[PDB]
């Protein structure tokens, strides 16, 4: 019964087929690789509030 190990080693190539099968079976996702470089947050502006355009006559 020693030939079990010999047979498994010799026939091990079929695991490539098994890998292809499980690859086809598995669902897939992916990445949108993130950007670095938010090193400078930006404020709005120097903003001053005032009454609008008065309509004089």
């Amino acid at each position: 019964a020693s030939l079990i190990y010999r047979q498994l080693l010799t026939n091990s190539y079929s695991v490539d087929l098994y890998d292809e099968i499980e690859q086809i079976g598995s669902g897939k996702t992916q990445n949108v690789t993130i950007n670095p470089g938010p090193f400078a947050q930006t404020r709005y502006a120097p903003v001053n509030w005032d009454h609008g355009e008065i309509n004089d006559s």
């Binding site: 509030w49 009454h51 609008g52 008065i54 309509n55 004089d56």
Partner: protein, 48 residues
Amino acid sequence: KAANYQYNYLRDGEQVTAHTTCSVNGVNNFSYNGGFLPTDFGISRYEV
């Protein structure tokens, strides 16, 4: 005419100071002439 006004009020405790100015646009203007004599009373133009 443009009328300004400032005030404050309460809003969940946080005293809010508010400042506003009101005006009008699309105003109609009526011209009434009661009489033409110097003594007569007249309004050349009143807004509505």
